[PDB]
Ligand binder design. Sequence first.
Ligand SMILES: [K+]
Ligand SMILES: [K+]
Ligand SMILES: [K+]
Ligand SMILES: [Mg+2]
Ligand SMILES: [Mg+2]
Ligand SMILES: [Mg+2]
Ligand SMILES: [Mg+2]
Ligand SMILES: [Mg+2]
Ligand SMILES: [Mg+2]
Ligand SMILES: [Mg+2]
Ligand SMILES: [Mg+2]
Ligand SMILES: [Mg+2]
Ligand SMILES: [Zn+2]
Lengths: 225, 132, 343, 103
Amino acid sequence: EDSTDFNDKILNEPLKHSDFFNVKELFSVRSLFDARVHLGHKAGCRHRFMEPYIFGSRLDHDIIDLEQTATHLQLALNFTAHMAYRKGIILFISRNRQFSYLIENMARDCGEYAHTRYFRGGMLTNARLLFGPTVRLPDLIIFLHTLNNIFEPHVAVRDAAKMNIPTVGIVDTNCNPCLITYPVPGNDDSPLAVHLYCRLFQTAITRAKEKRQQVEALYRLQGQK
Amino acid sequence: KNRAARVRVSKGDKPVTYEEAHAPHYIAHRKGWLSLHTGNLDGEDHAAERTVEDVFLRKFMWGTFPGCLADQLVLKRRGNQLEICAVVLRQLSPHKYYFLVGYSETLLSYFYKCPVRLHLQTVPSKVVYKYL
Amino acid sequence: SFFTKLTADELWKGALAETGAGAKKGRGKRTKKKKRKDLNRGQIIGEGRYGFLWPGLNVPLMKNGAVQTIAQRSKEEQEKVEADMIQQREEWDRKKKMKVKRERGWSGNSWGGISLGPPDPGPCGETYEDFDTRILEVRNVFTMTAKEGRKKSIRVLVAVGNGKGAAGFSIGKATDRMDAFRKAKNRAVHHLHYIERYEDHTIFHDISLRFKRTHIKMKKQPKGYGLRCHRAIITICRLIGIKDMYAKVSGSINMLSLTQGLFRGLSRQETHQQLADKKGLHVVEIREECGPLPIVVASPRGPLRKDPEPEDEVPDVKLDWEDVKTAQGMKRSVWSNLKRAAT
Amino acid sequence: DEPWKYLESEEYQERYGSRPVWADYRRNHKGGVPPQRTRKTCIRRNKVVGNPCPICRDHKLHVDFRNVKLLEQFVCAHTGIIFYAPYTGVCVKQHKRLTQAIQ
RNA sequence: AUAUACCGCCAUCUUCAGCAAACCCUGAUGAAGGCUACAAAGUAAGCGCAAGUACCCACGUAAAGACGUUAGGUCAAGGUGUAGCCC
Ligand SMILES: [K+]
Ligand SMILES: [K+]
Ligand SMILES: [K+]
Ligand SMILES: [Mg+2]
Ligand SMILES: [Mg+2]
Ligand SMILES: [Mg+2]
Ligand SMILES: [Mg+2]
Ligand SMILES: [Mg+2]
Ligand SMILES: [Mg+2]
Ligand SMILES: [Mg+2]
Ligand SMILES: [Mg+2]
Ligand SMILES: [Mg+2]
Ligand SMILES: [Zn+2]
């Protein structure tokens, strides 16, 4: 009797709005351009499945079309915010050691999880053995870098799909986005780009958790009276 | 490869007791002796006779309490007293354990011409030390 | 001598000879192995050949409120006890010989087609009672090792399905066959395909594919046609829930390539709703049983095109000589269209 | 006298349920391709063969033109054709009686 | 009689460090394979080594030394399956 009203006012109401958390105010094509998000790798490193997202090559350096990044980033931030609102477990994954410390801190600050270390075989597909039969896996995996340190796709991209976990991922021009649920074409190398991504996801997640408490609190006060 | 008194590794499903899990080189190091008497001390006599008596009592008790013994017997000799300490299961009715204690103590006292006492410790199931 | 006697465990371990050089590499052509029998099973403590009645051990301690005294059964009364113990023993032997009858699969000695039951319930109280498991192949594979030489293992292929479109298959490997069965069936439920069925009885369209060297040609069929397909395809189709289909397997007939090809073909079929949405046209079904009545089976969810589909006077589609040879009455096979049991 | 009653009793429902009486029958034969004719008869001089057909194995099943619920089990519901004998495994003797009762 | 039916107790590599349940992943779900630390699919109970213990130390020497290998040795230690002998 009271559960259907709960799930309808709290869980289903945010899903009826195009931008319930107003994540479009967090970034702009200019803000992305200043963070050097459009800068990709040289043409010789281009991955075939990234051609649709490439604006062009400027003297053999691929340029990422920020008009597409803006639309893909909007979807990724929106999805990420909704998953944080629903109290989903968000796991950040990246092997880029220059940003391991930054990413681990961003996860702790937003109240989420980070895995920036060597990824051991079976963390996801064999989690019950490694952690226990009652272990809860992540509801969303966010890749700030989709490649490992030998320039291959991070094993968790394949294993996240095997476990039917949606993935958000920054995909540079040398990355393979086929299995990434919400790919975001963008520069993954420059500290300005990576720092921006961490600010955006951190802000999206922090806002969505605060929104969940506001809605719940209002739903309770009105319930008593 | 040495075989003597070694329970060999299996698939991890074979329960062994503490007595069974220790090879002979652990005797006096990790496991004690199952019979204690003075016959094997320096300058003491009748070790052969104590050994025959011990072999009989172990066979005798195995068949007198069939399916009830959960571990090896502990044999203690003090003076002319003989104490038999056995760990048994809790399947047989207590009336049968009292019958067999009275029967065994009396029969063994007349056989070896010494006061024999039987001490029973009951356990719900065989105590498992490890699964080999 | 009393002192030369051993325990039953020692006597059976020796007599059975389960461990030995003969068991190591199956060095002997042997069939019927001695089986250990527990000789203390029906034995009562206190009962002996002489028939003595010991109060408190084999007879009640108190009778009519008084302690019983030592007594001995009469010769006649003891003969009955011995006979009753033999009959009790014969019943134990008789029943053990008697067995329940295994339902056979594709042949009497084959594992293929035999059900393994539902997969085991998962650790988190997950259950698969709705799923049935079928064996497709049991193979003895061998590897050569430095020490042990020719080593024997079991490779098992099983398929699982709930009969409502959800089905999968997995390979199982182990030294023992029952362990291979457990691994295969439990793994398959984590690799399930969903197979779309037209009217929940057949496929949506003819499927012709090659997987490696195995060719599989499947034809959509009407109700009542049954499963006229390779026996393994019949087994898999019952797990999916397909009742009416024709299939012909050509080329290499490999069970794993046939199973993997089958699931690929069935997973990659276009439904009528998908066809309508892709082309923005109505999908109209014509049945000779229903005459010229046009039956719309699928309509596009989005806008409906106004331009008719181009009518190519002659289609440039590739034809199978087998289908053409049959439609022309030129395919003459004594083995085709034979009467068979309901499948 | 009233053969249609057996199909409405509890004994029938426990033995066959909602499946046809021939659902669980399997012919014993060598090879993968069975003989194109079933056995001539399962009852020979009042003696029954070891693997009697679906009709002959249950003496309470009476092939009669009034027991239409049994006859329906040997006709295709979608095409109305009478199954050939190897389809259900009925002996040639009973398949003729079924075909005559159906007609 | 049969150690080529075995228990039991052993030789041998071993003056070795490997064996391996249960999972997971790779190979198009083939026999099979599974590592790189500025790490790239393995996690591994248990067994052995190791550690502890004995002898005069923490050294040395003993002891220990898995799974398997040689149908290795022993039916004549004892027990025992099968077959055979019973004036
Ligand atoms: K031996
Ligand atoms: K011997
Ligand atoms: K012998
Ligand atoms: Mg990059
Ligand atoms: Mg040695
Ligand atoms: Mg032979
Ligand atoms: Mg047979
Ligand atoms: Mg030998
Ligand atoms: Mg030392
Ligand atoms: Mg030594
Ligand atoms: Mg050591
Ligand atoms: Mg030899
Ligand atoms: Zn018949």
